[PDB]
Design a protein around this nucleic acid. Structure first.
Lengths: 143, 127, 103, 63, 103, 135, 37, 63, 63
RNA sequence: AAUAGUGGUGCUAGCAUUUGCUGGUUAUCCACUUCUUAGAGGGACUAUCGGUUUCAAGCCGAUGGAAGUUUGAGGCAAUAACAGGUCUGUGAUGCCCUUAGACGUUCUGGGCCGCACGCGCGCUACACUGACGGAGCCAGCGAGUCUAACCUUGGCCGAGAGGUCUUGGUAAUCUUGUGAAACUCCGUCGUGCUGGGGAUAGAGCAUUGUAAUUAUUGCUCUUCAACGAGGAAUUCCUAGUAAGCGCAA
């Protein structure tokens, strides 16, 4: 009768969590969120005007769950697209770093994820008793 | 100690090891329940080894499988190769052979490639 | 949901009509580009039966608002009966009609 | 810009067999989002008996 | 009296199973502690070059190959036991190395 | 969602510096019909306009048509960075401005004609291309 | 370098041997390269 | 000659002597500022069509 | 797509002439035999040579 | 088999908790080879039955089998007029100036790079089986630094592009699980050459070297121009094959 993080939905679990984070408002949201898109390869700032900053910040916590450590180079090489070059053939996307640098630092203020001695930023017992516990709060969304 | 065996299933360079244990019956695909695999259309292909013999023989089992390699399509085929041949190792080490062959006949009447993996490797070009 | 009883039934009867009973030949004739007496094998018959139903749906769903699934709905129930109102039918028919001439 | 989105839809909904985006674009004024928001309003109205739905398309019929 | 490690990375596979046998032979006549010869995945070299001196003619190419095999053994012995036997297992084309890494 | 039925009041012709807009579209696509402004530029100014992002012409408040050019004519006043502009660090005055529809041809000919005839501050072998092969 | 056989181009810069490839086919044996497939 | 930036220390000076064969006649005009000293000399004569009535090339051939 | 070359064909009837009482209609036995009474260089050539002798040997039980 | 991996015993965190399901890492220690890698061998012969044929060579079905198209793919194998085979080939040609050489260098701008049509072997199209935006997230063969600048992860600033502080890696250990793309759900969009398609362009910031104008390349914002499936014709590519999709040397 007790779950881990591993036995919930994938897309839906972020949605219920970030909407709770939408009620929180405890995020250092910088001024240039209106202008700067996610990478260079994308064409437009997203159709979400507000909750996209809640979206990426939720899922980066979701990805360090199963993992040991995450630096910043990894989630650069992650984020789901293909660079168009015009009339020349395509190439893989690489993501921007400034929009990921602060949002990784934006969870140290709330006790989630911190630097491992091996060299990456990882969850400890701060999230391991709370982030699972609010993932356990997503079990109410299962019914 | 506990009755425990290992099997594995391959398709197009994609492996799927299996660990069999004994218990209430948990089927773990790489650390997750089996009812959550992302090619949602192919969700019932993994149900096929379970939905051939009835839901009976599993209150004494435990199944943990993990995969590597391949794409998002072959790994669906790889897991049901090791799972279906994983059940017979109980019935070829512990339970008798008349219980073995009745599901052996039940599988290979329906799918020859549930027991025996394919043999269709790729090919080098302009050489 | 389009007023019937079995969704797998609506295609297995449909290919009964669209297996062309007669045929032309695929030859000129040696200068006199003619068409002679010929019939079709059944295992060849089913092959071209299904395929001409399919290819009509692409242009039926090319560049218009309706989707593919909306085409395949109306096409097969058109193909379910002898109507010759669908392109899946009204190109196999005129093949068979000139085959009733030539021979 | 008041009646054309008021009588052919709020009254003449249950006349058909099923409902998709094909019937709603039979007017050349009801655009893509306009036809989309029609079922999006009508699912609240309960006339839609749903069958299957995903992001590319739904399968909807009336009550 | 120190744990050592020997490597040998050669390219004549017939002349590497004689050497790796007599390594484990005279150690086991003195019965030291050991772990078996672990055989690594081999390395292949290749270079595609087309097959003409000039350029005038049809086009496909060559492909050349060279195979490197490498295996290594860990060992512990008194130094007087090992410092003699590593000097009587010489053979041309064969490389021998000693590593006493005990960090 | 719902059925909102407004009394028409929609303008097939607009008047924003000789720009007549078929405003039965999204307003960020409405501004792109002018020159010098595209969807990479018009994206933020409607987000700067703080309105609904789905409206047509028949529902716009009348002050906002003044407002949208007011943010346009005062670009750096309301937090537009340097990398969000067309004309930047000019050869005549060094300042940085953006351009409307009917004046992209301004700062165009005079800035090319110096490279065309006068053998200008840089244009002495950039002197025949838009003249002999691409005039 | 231009090594020998009317070549300063098409050099094999890989593996640090630096041979003109006209004069590689006749020297690839005794280096210990051989073709097999 | 071809490589340096222009200096403010110039008035009308006819820079350029021989330094090869393609001559570099560089008079100064009066003060058009911020550029290389390379964009003046001979590099290609702009000869139009001598017999270019086969403009680029032919069509698919047939005789 | 598979007929047997004469060096299979010829040596298959030389072996049947010197050791006929020793041979046997089953292939798996006399697979182990040709290495004893003859010298076969490869392994696949042995498998082909003993393959057709047994096929030859059942002719003897009819003609 | 600490240069692969699981299986426990632990230190150890969650834990619905309550037996429990996920973690925990150097060394907590022991026991293991199924998966992994590489040596030694084995295994397929068209086997066994049924047809068919001068009953011959064989060819078709059948059930077994990892495998039944020479089992899949390559390497290797000489008769001949292309006076293209030339390396300090020598011609083992006597005129090329063949010795103020028109063969060197440093030290110089100009070689493939000029308007109006291609037989140049597909590239980016012509769209809702689609774009755009959110997510979900899977691989294979290859490569690399000392007389010296090769790979590059964290922490760094910045919108990219990059810059700075560090390391790690002479090689299954490090980069690297090379988190590749198509595809995959949830959305926005609505058939008009519109948000499909960006072909010529002007304004800018960066890097690499002795030096980028005639844009060497790369990121900004603008501009969006031929282009509605192609006349007569005619094709490097064979069942995990044809086609898309890669982005490794």
């Amino acid at each position: 009768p007790g779950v881990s993080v591993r036995d919930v939905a994938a897309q839906d679990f972020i949605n219920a969590y970030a909407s709770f984070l939408q009620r929180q408002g405890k995020l250092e949201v910088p001024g240039y969120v209106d202008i700067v898109k996610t990478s260079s390869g994308n064409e437009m700032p997203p159709q979400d005007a507000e909750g996209w900053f809640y979206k990426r910040a939720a899922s980066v916590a979701r990805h360090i769950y199963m993992r040991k450590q995450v630096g910043v180079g990894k989630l650069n090489k992650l984020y789901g697209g293909a660079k168009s070059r015009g009339v020349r053939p395509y190439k893989h996307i690489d993501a921007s770093g400034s929009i990921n640098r602060k949002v990784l630092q934006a969870l140290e203020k709330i006790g989630i994820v911190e630097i491992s001695p091996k060299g990456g930023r990882r969850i400890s017992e701060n999230g391991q008793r709370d982030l699972d516990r609010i993932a356990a709060q997503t079990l109410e969304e299962d019914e | 100690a506990v009755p425990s065996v290992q099997t594995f299933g391959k398709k197009k360079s994609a492996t799927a090891v299996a660990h069999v244990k004994a218990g209430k019956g948990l089927i773990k695909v790489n650390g997750s329940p089996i009812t959550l695999v992302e090619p949602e259309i192919l969700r019932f292909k993994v149900y096929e080894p379970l939905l051939l013999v009835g839901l009976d023989k599993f209150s004494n089992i435990d199944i943990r499988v993990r995969v590597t390699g391949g794409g998002h399509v072959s790994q669906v085929y790889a897991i049901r190769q090791a799972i279906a041949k994983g059940l017979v190792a109980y019935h070829q080490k512990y339970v008798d052979e008349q219980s073995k062959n009745e599901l052996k006949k039940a599988f290979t009447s329906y799918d020859r490639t549930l027991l025996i993996a394919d043999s269709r490797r790729p090919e080098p070009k302009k050489f | 949901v389009l007023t019937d009883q079995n969704p797998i039934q609506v295609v297995v009867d449909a290919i009964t009509n669209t297996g062309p009973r007669e045929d032309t030949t695929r030859v000129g004739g040696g200068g006199a580009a003619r068409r002679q007496a010929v019939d079709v094998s059944p295992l060849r018959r089913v092959n071209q039966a299904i395929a001409l139903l399919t290819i009509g749906a692409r242009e039926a769903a090319f560049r218009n608002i309706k989707t593919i699934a909306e085409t395949l709905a109306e096409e097969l129930i058109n193909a379910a009966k002898g109507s010759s109102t669908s392109y899946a039918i009204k190109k196999k028919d005129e093949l068979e009609r000139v085959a009733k001439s030539n021979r | 810009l008041d009646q054309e989105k008021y009588d052919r839809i709020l009254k003449e909904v249950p006349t058909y067999r099923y409902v998709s985006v094909s019937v709603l674009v039979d007017r050349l004024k009801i655009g893509g989002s306009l036809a989309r928001i029609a079922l999006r309003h009508l699912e609240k109205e309960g006339i839609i008996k749903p069958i299957s739905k995903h992001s590319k398309q739904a399968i909807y019929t009336r009550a | 009296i120190i744990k050592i490690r020997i490597t040998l990375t050669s390219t004549k596979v017939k002349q590497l199973e004689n050497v790796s046998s007599n390594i484990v032979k005279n150690a086991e006549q003195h019965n030291l502690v050991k772990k078996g010869p672990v055989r690594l995945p081999t390395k292949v070299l290749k270079i595609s070059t087309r097959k003409t001196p000039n350029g005038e003619g049809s086009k496909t190419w060559e492909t050349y190959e060279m195979r490197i095999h490498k295996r290594y053994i860990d060992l512990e012995a008194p130094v007087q036991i090992v410092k003699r036997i590593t000097q009587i297992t010489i053979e041309p084309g064969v490389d021998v190395e000693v590593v006493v890494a005990s960090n | 969602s719902l059925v909102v039925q407004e009394q028409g009041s929609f303008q097939h012709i607009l008047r924003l510096l000789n720009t007549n807009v078929d405003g039965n579209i999204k307003i960020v696509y409405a501004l792109t019909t002018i020159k010098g402004v595209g969807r990479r530029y018009s994206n933020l100014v409607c987000k700067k306009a703080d309105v609904d992002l789905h409206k047509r012409a028949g529902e716009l408040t009348q002050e906002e048509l003044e407002r949208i050019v007011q943010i346009m004519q005062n670009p750096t006043h309301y937090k537009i960075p340097a990398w969000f502009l067309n004309r930047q660090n000019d050869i005549t005055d060094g300042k940085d401005y953006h351009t409307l529809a009917n004046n992209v041809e301004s700062k165009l000919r005079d800035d090319l004609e110096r490279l065309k005839k006068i053998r200008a501050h840089r244009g002495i072998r950039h002197f025949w291309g838009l003249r002999v092969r691409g005039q | 370098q231009c090594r020998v056989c009317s070549s300063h181009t098409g050099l094999i810069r890989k593996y640090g041997l630096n041979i003109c490839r006209q004069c590689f086919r006749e020297k690839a044996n005794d280096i210990g390269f051989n073709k097999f497939r | 000659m071809r490589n340096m930036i222009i200096v403010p220390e110039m008035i009308g000076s006819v820079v350029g002597i021989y330094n090869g064969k393609a001559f570099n006649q560089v008079e100064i005009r009066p003060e058009m500022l911020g550029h290389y000293l390379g964009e003046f000399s001979i590099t290609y004569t702009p000869v139009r069509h001598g017999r270019a009535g086969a403009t680029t090339s032919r069509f698919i051939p047939l005789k | 797509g598979r007929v047997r070359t004469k060096t299979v064909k010829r040596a298959s009837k030389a072996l049947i002439e010197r050791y006929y009482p020793k041979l046997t209609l089953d292939f798996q036995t006399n697979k182990r035999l040709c290495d004893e009474i003859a010298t076969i260089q490869s392994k696949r050539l042995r498998n082909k040579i003993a393959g057709y002798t047994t096929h030859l040997m059942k002719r003897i039980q009819k003609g």
